């Protein structure tokens, strides 16, 4: 609970300290990168993570819509080009889907997206729509915290995904530099740390939803049906 | 998947059929009303449900803000008076909190609210903000689907809560009558069923979050800390 404004370097350290709560520490993530995850768990992960990825560009556009500074927009738009392509990351993820046995329609349809994942992700969007652009922009800085096994995974799609993700052009540090410039009072600094925590909560909550469904055999409505019964529509956009 | 517009009576039956997915069928809810719930589970439930309750009036006001029909507003505002009082339901829930051993500050602070609960609830609000008023209004119709044991529970607060909830004046059927009037095409009807499913998903997801935290010993960041580390702020409103 910051009492006296921290310096920019010290603030950066505090922000980086929040990485301790990054989602790589979630048992579900651990199990996937341990090879202890089942195939159900893997396909679930890709389908659900895809929703996040298709939301990012909407989230970034929301930020731009709220940002009257042309130079900031000139940088921010590169995030949208990265995701949308013109291949792009959405496309790269479609290839990973294929590699793990899911069709493009399976993914594009968003039919497999668990409501807990949806709500967590949409929270990110709705923050970006409503928050001052600086705050929303800064929340992107968690990207700084970043099979075989699984023989059944198609090498070619994989490498394809891994590879497309590697040509992104956005300035991943932008959020950080902004936060250090913008958060120049104790009050802003504490609030920024809480915004970071919000973002970390989104990522952890996505994984909790996946844990319940694919690892604990407790998907939505499991006591009442064996079919997927959850809503599958971005109701206010579609 | 409605192909030919249903009649109003048949549509009502379809809507009521969605009650099969109501949250009373969630293992967490079952355990509470079975007396199989632990005290941790109960206090968690009250603290987390409280967030829903404090959001309802915001949700209802959002609907009104989107509703240029004065007569509709004249009815809808009664929902806000019910919750806000002037005692009201928010107050009634504060008394139940007391009955189960939680202080007013504990509840009002929203500090115990799990992020999964928060995201699910905020989804409701953000739907209400953005959707046409008719759609948002109709989603309220799930209210139509509606300790000892637990000796440690204070009878007086309880009865107090149970009792205040019983003097609400809103027209719980309003959403239904609107849906029957408004949803006069196959397309609107299918969409309304999907909106209902959305609402049901919110309620189930709230309970999943509670299940993970209080029943499966898997609250957020459990692999990294034993303290509550999640964000506790309505960032865009506070
Ligand atoms: O908020 C944002 O705009 C960024 C955009 C983004 C990505 O493109 C990821 O692939 C991506 C993240 C983000 N966040 C995630 C993030 O930290 O938010 C990390 C996650 C991962 O692979 O672990 N991948
Ligand atoms: O969407 C809405 O406006 C209504 C308002 C409301 C309440 O006041 C509840 O107590 C309340 C609900 C709702 N929904 C819940 C709902 O069905 O949405 C049910 C739940 C229960 O006690 O089981 N309690």
PDB file of N, CA and C and ligand atoms in Angstrom, chain B residues 22-24 29 33 45 49 52-53 56-57 59-60 63 76 79 82-83 89 93 124 136-146 161 165 168 170 172 199-200 202-203, ligand 2:
ATOM      1  N   UNK B  22     -31.843 -23.668 -13.658  1.00  0.00           N
ATOM      2  CA  UNK B  22     -31.743 -22.709 -12.594  1.00  0.00           C
ATOM      3  C   UNK B  22     -30.748 -23.175 -11.564  1.00  0.00           C
ATOM      4  N   UNK B  23     -30.218 -22.228 -10.808  1.00  0.00           N
ATOM      5  CA  UNK B  23     -29.085 -22.499  -9.961  1.00  0.00           C
ATOM      6  C   UNK B  23     -29.371 -23.381  -8.744  1.00  0.00           C
ATOM      7  N   UNK B  24     -30.638 -23.599  -8.450  1.00  0.00           N
ATOM      8  CA  UNK B  24     -30.986 -24.511  -7.388  1.00  0.00           C
ATOM      9  C   UNK B  24     -30.499 -25.907  -7.663  1.00  0.00           C
ATOM     10  N   UNK B  29     -25.471 -25.129  -4.077  1.00  0.00           N
ATOM     11  CA  UNK B  29     -26.723 -24.685  -3.559  1.00  0.00           C
ATOM     12  C   UNK B  29     -27.381 -25.834  -2.844  1.00  0.00           C
ATOM     13  N   UNK B  33     -28.611 -26.066   1.276  1.00  0.00           N
ATOM     14  CA  UNK B  33     -29.976 -26.319   1.692  1.00  0.00           C
ATOM     15  C   UNK B  33     -30.149 -27.741   2.189  1.00  0.00           C
ATOM     16  N   UNK B  45     -20.785 -17.666   0.766  1.00  0.00           N
ATOM     17  CA  UNK B  45     -21.977 -17.514  -0.031  1.00  0.00           C
ATOM     18  C   UNK B  45     -22.647 -16.205   0.199  1.00  0.00           C
ATOM     19  N   UNK B  49     -22.874 -13.474  -2.703  1.00  0.00           N
ATOM     20  CA  UNK B  49     -24.201 -13.125  -3.133  1.00  0.00           C
ATOM     21  C   UNK B  49     -24.508 -11.686  -2.879  1.00  0.00           C
ATOM     22  N   UNK B  52     -23.910  -9.493  -5.911  1.00  0.00           N
ATOM     23  CA  UNK B  52     -25.001  -9.566  -6.835  1.00  0.00           C
ATOM     24  C   UNK B  52     -26.058  -8.603  -6.386  1.00  0.00           C
ATOM     25  N   UNK B  53     -26.438  -8.667  -5.127  1.00  0.00           N
ATOM     26  CA  UNK B  53     -27.500  -7.823  -4.659  1.00  0.00           C
ATOM     27  C   UNK B  53     -27.196  -6.340  -4.728  1.00  0.00           C
ATOM     28  N   UNK B  56     -27.691  -5.280  -8.545  1.00  0.00           N
ATOM     29  CA  UNK B  56     -29.025  -5.221  -9.090  1.00  0.00           C
ATOM     30  C   UNK B  56     -29.571  -3.824  -9.298  1.00  0.00           C
ATOM     31  N   UNK B  57     -29.485  -2.954  -8.301  1.00  0.00           N
ATOM     32  CA  UNK B  57     -29.982  -1.601  -8.500  1.00  0.00           C
ATOM     33  C   UNK B  57     -29.225  -0.846  -9.585  1.00  0.00           C
ATOM     34  N   UNK B  59     -27.909  -2.277 -12.139  1.00  0.00           N
ATOM     35  CA  UNK B  59     -28.421  -2.945 -13.330  1.00  0.00           C
ATOM     36  C   UNK B  59     -29.784  -2.405 -13.737  1.00  0.00           C
ATOM     37  N   UNK B  60     -30.663  -2.227 -12.786  1.00  0.00           N
ATOM     38  CA  UNK B  60     -31.968  -1.676 -13.052  1.00  0.00           C
ATOM     39  C   UNK B  60     -31.960  -0.219 -13.488  1.00  0.00           C
ATOM     40  N   UNK B  63     -30.996  -0.080 -17.139  1.00  0.00           N
ATOM     41  CA  UNK B  63     -32.160  -0.368 -17.966  1.00  0.00           C
ATOM     42  C   UNK B  63     -33.033   0.870 -18.155  1.00  0.00           C
ATOM     43  N   UNK B  76     -40.437   0.071 -13.496  1.00  0.00           N
ATOM     44  CA  UNK B  76     -39.092  -0.414 -13.257  1.00  0.00           C
ATOM     45  C   UNK B  76     -38.454   0.207 -12.031  1.00  0.00           C
ATOM     46  N   UNK B  79     -38.193  -1.469  -8.613  1.00  0.00           N
ATOM     47  CA  UNK B  79     -37.155  -2.407  -8.322  1.00  0.00           C
ATOM     48  C   UNK B  79     -36.034  -1.748  -7.546  1.00  0.00           C
ATOM     49  N   UNK B  82     -37.061  -1.133  -3.998  1.00  0.00           N
ATOM     50  CA  UNK B  82     -37.022  -2.399  -3.297  1.00  0.00           C
ATOM     51  C   UNK B  82     -35.656  -2.719  -2.793  1.00  0.00           C
ATOM     52  N   UNK B  83     -34.635  -2.426  -3.576  1.00  0.00           N
ATOM     53  CA  UNK B  83     -33.303  -2.801  -3.189  1.00  0.00           C
ATOM     54  C   UNK B  83     -32.670  -1.787  -2.292  1.00  0.00           C
ATOM     55  N   UNK B  89     -33.597  -4.437   0.298  1.00  0.00           N
ATOM     56  CA  UNK B  89     -32.950  -5.714   0.276  1.00  0.00           C
ATOM     57  C   UNK B  89     -31.466  -5.678   0.513  1.00  0.00           C
ATOM     58  N   UNK B  93     -29.818  -8.034   3.433  1.00  0.00           N
ATOM     59  CA  UNK B  93     -28.702  -8.923   3.270  1.00  0.00           C
ATOM     60  C   UNK B  93     -27.586  -8.607   4.243  1.00  0.00           C
ATOM     61  N   UNK B 124     -23.683  -9.097 -16.069  1.00  0.00           N
ATOM     62  CA  UNK B 124     -25.079  -8.748 -16.034  1.00  0.00           C
ATOM     63  C   UNK B 124     -25.277  -7.251 -16.188  1.00  0.00           C
ATOM     64  N   UNK B 136     -32.850  -6.414 -21.906  1.00  0.00           N
ATOM     65  CA  UNK B 136     -32.288  -6.387 -20.578  1.00  0.00           C
ATOM     66  C   UNK B 136     -33.392  -6.580 -19.569  1.00  0.00           C
ATOM     67  N   UNK B 137     -34.512  -5.927 -19.789  1.00  0.00           N
ATOM     68  CA  UNK B 137     -35.628  -6.048 -18.886  1.00  0.00           C
ATOM     69  C   UNK B 137     -36.114  -7.501 -18.780  1.00  0.00           C
ATOM     70  N   UNK B 138     -36.224  -8.153 -19.907  1.00  0.00           N
ATOM     71  CA  UNK B 138     -36.703  -9.505 -19.969  1.00  0.00           C
ATOM     72  C   UNK B 138     -35.821 -10.481 -19.221  1.00  0.00           C
ATOM     73  N   UNK B 139     -34.532 -10.217 -19.173  1.00  0.00           N
ATOM     74  CA  UNK B 139     -33.624 -11.121 -18.515  1.00  0.00           C
ATOM     75  C   UNK B 139     -33.861 -11.237 -17.028  1.00  0.00           C
ATOM     76  N   UNK B 140     -34.677 -10.371 -16.483  1.00  0.00           N
ATOM     77  CA  UNK B 140     -35.009 -10.428 -15.082  1.00  0.00           C
ATOM     78  C   UNK B 140     -35.989 -11.545 -14.745  1.00  0.00           C
ATOM     79  N   UNK B 141     -36.544 -12.182 -15.755  1.00  0.00           N
ATOM     80  CA  UNK B 141     -37.624 -13.115 -15.505  1.00  0.00           C
ATOM     81  C   UNK B 141     -37.207 -14.408 -14.822  1.00  0.00           C
ATOM     82  N   UNK B 142     -35.929 -14.660 -14.710  1.00  0.00           N
ATOM     83  CA  UNK B 142     -35.491 -15.758 -13.912  1.00  0.00           C
ATOM     84  C   UNK B 142     -35.916 -15.688 -12.450  1.00  0.00           C
ATOM     85  N   UNK B 143     -36.334 -14.539 -11.963  1.00  0.00           N
ATOM     86  CA  UNK B 143     -36.755 -14.496 -10.574  1.00  0.00           C
ATOM     87  C   UNK B 143     -38.017 -15.304 -10.396  1.00  0.00           C
ATOM     88  N   UNK B 144     -38.652 -15.659 -11.497  1.00  0.00           N
ATOM     89  CA  UNK B 144     -39.817 -16.529 -11.508  1.00  0.00           C
ATOM     90  C   UNK B 144     -39.517 -17.996 -11.250  1.00  0.00           C
ATOM     91  N   UNK B 145     -38.269 -18.379 -11.378  1.00  0.00           N
ATOM     92  CA  UNK B 145     -37.887 -19.732 -11.151  1.00  0.00           C
ATOM     93  C   UNK B 145     -37.689 -19.994  -9.682  1.00  0.00           C
ATOM     94  N   UNK B 146     -37.716 -18.960  -8.876  1.00  0.00           N
ATOM     95  CA  UNK B 146     -37.536 -19.144  -7.460  1.00  0.00           C
ATOM     96  C   UNK B 146     -38.864 -19.559  -6.854  1.00  0.00           C
ATOM     97  N   UNK B 161     -33.817 -10.886   7.747  1.00  0.00           N
ATOM     98  CA  UNK B 161     -33.490 -10.899   6.339  1.00  0.00           C
ATOM     99  C   UNK B 161     -34.624 -11.518   5.585  1.00  0.00           C
ATOM    100  N   UNK B 165     -37.017  -9.336   2.765  1.00  0.00           N
ATOM    101  CA  UNK B 165     -37.085  -9.747   1.393  1.00  0.00           C
ATOM    102  C   UNK B 165     -38.512  -9.957   1.012  1.00  0.00           C
ATOM    103  N   UNK B 168     -40.821  -6.836  -0.885  1.00  0.00           N
ATOM    104  CA  UNK B 168     -40.521  -6.232  -2.178  1.00  0.00           C
ATOM    105  C   UNK B 168     -41.804  -5.947  -2.944  1.00  0.00           C
ATOM    106  N   UNK B 170     -41.834  -4.901  -6.536  1.00  0.00           N
ATOM    107  CA  UNK B 170     -41.666  -5.014  -7.960  1.00  0.00           C
ATOM    108  C   UNK B 170     -42.592  -6.074  -8.522  1.00  0.00           C
ATOM    109  N   UNK B 172     -42.525  -8.987 -10.415  1.00  0.00           N
ATOM    110  CA  UNK B 172     -41.664 -10.052 -10.875  1.00  0.00           C
ATOM    111  C   UNK B 172     -42.078 -10.628 -12.223  1.00  0.00           C
ATOM    112  N   UNK B 199     -28.252 -15.407 -18.548  1.00  0.00           N
ATOM    113  CA  UNK B 199     -28.536 -15.082 -17.181  1.00  0.00           C
ATOM    114  C   UNK B 199     -28.361 -16.279 -16.267  1.00  0.00           C
ATOM    115  N   UNK B 200     -28.763 -17.439 -16.733  1.00  0.00           N
ATOM    116  CA  UNK B 200     -28.622 -18.653 -15.968  1.00  0.00           C
ATOM    117  C   UNK B 200     -27.173 -18.987 -15.803  1.00  0.00           C
ATOM    118  N   UNK B 202     -24.726 -16.871 -15.587  1.00  0.00           N
ATOM    119  CA  UNK B 202     -24.191 -15.956 -14.602  1.00  0.00           C
ATOM    120  C   UNK B 202     -24.348 -16.572 -13.237  1.00  0.00           C
ATOM    121  N   UNK B 203     -25.543 -17.003 -12.927  1.00  0.00           N
ATOM    122  CA  UNK B 203     -25.824 -17.586 -11.633  1.00  0.00           C
ATOM    123  C   UNK B 203     -25.070 -18.873 -11.347  1.00  0.00           C
TER     124      UNK B 203
HETATM  125  O1  LIG C   2     -32.444  -9.914 -12.361  1.00  0.00           O
HETATM  126  C1  LIG C   2     -33.098  -9.369 -11.499  1.00  0.00           C
HETATM  127  O2  LIG C   2     -33.366  -8.188 -11.470  1.00  0.00           O
HETATM  128  C2  LIG C   2     -33.682 -10.199 -10.360  1.00  0.00           C
HETATM  129  C3  LIG C   2     -33.566  -9.439  -9.057  1.00  0.00           C
HETATM  130  C4  LIG C   2     -33.307 -10.583  -8.097  1.00  0.00           C
HETATM  131  C5  LIG C   2     -33.386 -10.588  -6.704  1.00  0.00           C
HETATM  132  O3  LIG C   2     -33.696  -9.613  -6.043  1.00  0.00           O
HETATM  133  C6  LIG C   2     -33.114 -11.737  -6.018  1.00  0.00           C
HETATM  134  O4  LIG C   2     -33.189 -11.753  -4.798  1.00  0.00           O
HETATM  135  C7  LIG C   2     -32.761 -12.874  -6.700  1.00  0.00           C
HETATM  136  C8  LIG C   2     -32.682 -12.908  -8.089  1.00  0.00           C
HETATM  137  C9  LIG C   2     -32.949 -11.731  -8.812  1.00  0.00           C
HETATM  138  N1  LIG C   2     -32.941 -11.438 -10.112  1.00  0.00           N
HETATM  139  C10 LIG C   2     -32.236 -14.245  -8.711  1.00  0.00           C
HETATM  140  C11 LIG C   2     -32.578 -14.456 -10.182  1.00  0.00           C
HETATM  141  O5  LIG C   2     -33.251 -15.424 -10.488  1.00  0.00           O
HETATM  142  O6  LIG C   2     -32.040 -13.695 -10.978  1.00  0.00           O
HETATM  143  C12 LIG C   2     -32.717 -15.401  -7.862  1.00  0.00           C
HETATM  144  C13 LIG C   2     -32.108 -15.255  -6.480  1.00  0.00           C
HETATM  145  C14 LIG C   2     -32.537 -16.374  -5.511  1.00  0.00           C
HETATM  146  O7  LIG C   2     -32.815 -16.020  -4.355  1.00  0.00           O
HETATM  147  O8  LIG C   2     -32.515 -17.541  -5.928  1.00  0.00           O
HETATM  148  N2  LIG C   2     -32.506 -13.969  -5.920  1.00  0.00           N
END
